[PDB]
Amino acid sequence: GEELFTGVVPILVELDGDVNGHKFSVSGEGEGDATYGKLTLKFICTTGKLPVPWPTLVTTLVLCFSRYPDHMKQHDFFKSAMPEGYVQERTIFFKDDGNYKTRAEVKFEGDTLVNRIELKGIDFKEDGNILGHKLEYNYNSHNVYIMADKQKNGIKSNFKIRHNIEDGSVQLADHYQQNTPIGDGPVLLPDNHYLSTQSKLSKDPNEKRDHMVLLEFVTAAGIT
Q1: In the chain, how many domains are there?
Q2: Is 27:43 a contact under the CB 8 Å cutoff?
Q3: Which of 47, 64, 111, 213 makes the best surface tag, with the fewest CB within 10 Å?
């Protein structure tokens, strides 16, 4: 698995979304360079205006591009599953609002690393902070505890993302995540460890469609 990520790899993201029955689709293109834990992606809402805030989709829209240092490579579940790939499923609970359920397949199609997502959202407030677009277009750096899931030959994680509301308060997004190999393995089952993430959101001034430019760095920080 590791050999597939030694250089720069093209990325394709395809998301089909349905929140409270608002149907939408997002297409993403870019490249990842796991040597530096680095990825650059431009996302387009291909159905018009995104019905939810772009920052709420950052975690949903490829942790195989994380930099695992030498002493951590035995804990790299994400690359070990390649090229066949892994399934990444989440529930995202928005405090005092609705929740997303996502299921994604991350795998190689030829030389391209693909992330194909299905997203369903339920119980959102049509005029709340999410469907009302009241979140700031930014993102906080974050650390996540990746835990082994030996029952599923995979990994699992529980973490909190804090979105900035335009009124100066925080919109909490509780994440639960599980990952399993496509095709029943084999994979490296890791010991519990941390990934350190930072994400910069920007916009292409010449791009007239609703879009997000994302620069993301993820590093396996260590066991502790």
Answers
A1: 1
A2: yes
A3: 111
